[PDB]
Amino acid sequence: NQFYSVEVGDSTFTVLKRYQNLKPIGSQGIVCAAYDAVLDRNVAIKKLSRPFQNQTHAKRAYRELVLMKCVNHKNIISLLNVFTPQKTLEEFQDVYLVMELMDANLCQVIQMELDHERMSYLLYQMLCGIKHLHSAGIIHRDLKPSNIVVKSDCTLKILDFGLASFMMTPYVVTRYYRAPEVILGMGYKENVDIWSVGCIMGEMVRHKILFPGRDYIDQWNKVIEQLGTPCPEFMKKLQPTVRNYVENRPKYAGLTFPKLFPDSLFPADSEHNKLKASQARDLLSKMLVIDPAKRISVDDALQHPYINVWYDPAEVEAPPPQIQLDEREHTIEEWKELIYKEVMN
Ligand SMILES: O=C1/C(=N/O)c2cc(F)ccc2N1Cc1cc(F)cc2c1OCOC2
Numbered sequence: 247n248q249f250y251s252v253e254v255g256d257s258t259f260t261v262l263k264r265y266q267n268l269k270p271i272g273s274q275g276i277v278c279a280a281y282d283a284v285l286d287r288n289v290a291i292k293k294l295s296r297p298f299q300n301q302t303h304a305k306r307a308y309r310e311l312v313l314m315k316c317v318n319h320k321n322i323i324s325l326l327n328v329f330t331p332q333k334t335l336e337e338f339q340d341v342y343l344v345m346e347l348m349d350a351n352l353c354q355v356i357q358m359e360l361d362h363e364r365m366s367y368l369l370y371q372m373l374c375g376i377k378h379l380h381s382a383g384i385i386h387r388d389l390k391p392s393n394i395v396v397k398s399d400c401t402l403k404i405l406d407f408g409l410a411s412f413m414m415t416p417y418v419v420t421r422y423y424r425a426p427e428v429i430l431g432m433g434y435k436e437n438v439d440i441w442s443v444g445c446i447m448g449e450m451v452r453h454k455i456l457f458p459g460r461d462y463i464d465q466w467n468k469v470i471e472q473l474g475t476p477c478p479e480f481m482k483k484l485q486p487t488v489r490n491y492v493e494n495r496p497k498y499a500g501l502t503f504p505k506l507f508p509d510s511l512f513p514a515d516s517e518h519n520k521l522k523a524s525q526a527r528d529l530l531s532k533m534l535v536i537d538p539a540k541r542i543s544v545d546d547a548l549q550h551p552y553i554n555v556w557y558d559p560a561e562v563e564a565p566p567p568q569i570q571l572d573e574r575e576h577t578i579e580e581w582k583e584l585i586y587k588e589v590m591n
Contacts (some may be wrong), residue, residue: 248262249261249263249331250263252268254268254270254276257273257274257276257293257295257535259278259291259293259344259459260340261280261291261329261331261332261534262327263283263327264278264283264284264285264423265280265283265289265291265344266281266282267280267281267282268280268291271290274292274392274393276293276295277290277292277293277295277296277349278290278291278293278294278443279290279291285326287345287346287347288439289326289327289344289345289346289347290344290347291342291343291344292342292343292345293340293341293342294307294340294343295339295340296339296340296380296576297341297585298579298581298582298585299578299580301411301575301576302410302411302413303413304578304581304582304585305410305574305581307341307406308574308581308585308588309372309393309410309584310343310406310407311328311341311550311585311588311589312569312570312588313384313407313409313567313569314343315419316569316572317378317379317567318567318569319374319375319378319543319564320374320401320403320561321359321371321375321402321403321404321561322372322375322403322404323346323395323404323405324345324403324581325343325344325345325410326345326346328341328342328343328344328467328589328591329341329344329349329589330342330379330489330586330589330590332590334533334582335582335586336585338455341585341589345405346403347398348395348396348397348401348403348449349395349396349398350395350396351391351394351395351396352391352392352393352394352396352402352446353381353391353392355368355396355450356391356446356453357449357450357453359513360451361513362512362513362519362522362523362526365447366398366522366526366552366555366556367400367402367505367556368396368402368450369443369447369552369553370548370556370557371402372389372394372402372446373443373544373553374464374561374562375402375403375404375550376389376404376439376443376522377544377545377548377562378567380436380439381538382566382567382569383569384402385408385434385435385436386407386408386409386438386439386442387408387409387428387434387438387439387442388406388408388409388423388424388442389404389408389423389439389446390420390422390423390442391444391446392420392540394446400479410572412577413563417510419457421461421462421465422434422445422447422455422456422457422458422459422465423439423441423442423446424441424442425442425443425538426476426536426537426538427538429462429465429466429469430466430484430488431485431488432483432484432485432491435537435538435542436543436544437542437544438538439532439544440533440541440542440543440544441534441535441538443533444483444530444534445457447529447530447533448506448507448530448534451507451511451512451526451530452507456468456472456522456534456580457469466492466495467495469536470500470536471498471500472500472501472506473501473534473535473536474498474499474500474501475495475497475498475499476536476537479537479539480536480537480539494528503527503530503531504527507527507530509523512527525551526552527553528550528551529542529547529552532546532547532550533547548562548567
């Protein structure tokens with residue numbers, strides 16, 4: 247038999263025999279690190295348990311399978327192998343995704359102070375991964391630090407492809423990085439992801455979540471509290487019922503960016519460091535913009551002085567993926583077969 251079974255906490259991992267010394271590194275679902283004896287390297291293994299059980303799990307799993315396959319960019323996680331231990335459609339239950347492995351979540355990097363070279367390089371790569379996605383027509387909308395992984399040598403990759411919806415999960419879905427246009431459901435374009443990058447970068451500097459809060463109500467309060475109530479221009483673009491709510495909230499003038507992000511948070515002992523600090527804060531002030539009509543584009547932000555030192559036309563303008571009916575609604579049974587079909591290939 248090609249498979250063996252091993253307990254990893256309260257989950258059984260049934261994986262191919264090439265994969266060994268599994269260690270839980272996540273529970274973005276159930277993930278193990280493993281040594282792959284065939285390729286002689288370490289891999290990440292994600293167990294998708296009954297991905298067809300509901301529409302939300304099934305859409306995400308199918309979208310994860312399809313896109314991780316036909317996307318080949320250094321700043322997006324690579325798929326190495328896909329398998330099920332079950333032998334037929336009737337028996338079918340679990341999918342295992344085999345991805346390349348890095349060293350840490352972006353959560354762990356946020357907890358440390360970084361020099362400007364590393365901070366700016368990470369930010370450059372996030373912008374690269376996102377841009378490649380946009381040119382395939384993939385707008386992410388859910389970039390968060392737990393979806394972003396890094397290696398010791400400062401290399402960065404994005405793990406997921408974002409938003410495609412009720413669920414009975416014990417866990418909560420994080421909202422802290424979602425854009426004003428998503429929170430208020432007002433439509434969006436490419437620069438919806440720039441907001442998310444601004445939240446991450448600001449968290450990298452402050453070492454705290456910029457806009458925490460239990461709900462979209464609490465979350466909006468936090469946004470306007472720090473950045474100020476947005477313009478009439480912005481207001482006039484809101485559905486009258488959303489617009490009623492936003493316009494009838496307590497008003498804040500908001501804080502200037504020097505106030506929101508003081509120099510004590512940036513390395514600024516030397517002159518090179520002092521200049522980078524002001525470049526980093528400028529770019530923050532252009533990403534953390536509520537009105538997406540005034541928020542910086544992905545291309546403008548790659549051309550920004552803080553970022554552009556890393557600019558590579560091969561990394562920034564890589565041939566867009568080819569890629570298909572991806573607003574799909576299906577039953578459990580239909581999803582089951584689409585996924586199996588894709589897994590079996
Ligand atoms: O690098 C990855 C990864 N690659 O697919 C990966 C994939 C995931 F689904 C989750 C995390 C991933 N991490 C972060 C990570 C790597 C480790 F070797 C060890 C740990 C890591 O983070 C948690 O703490 C332990």
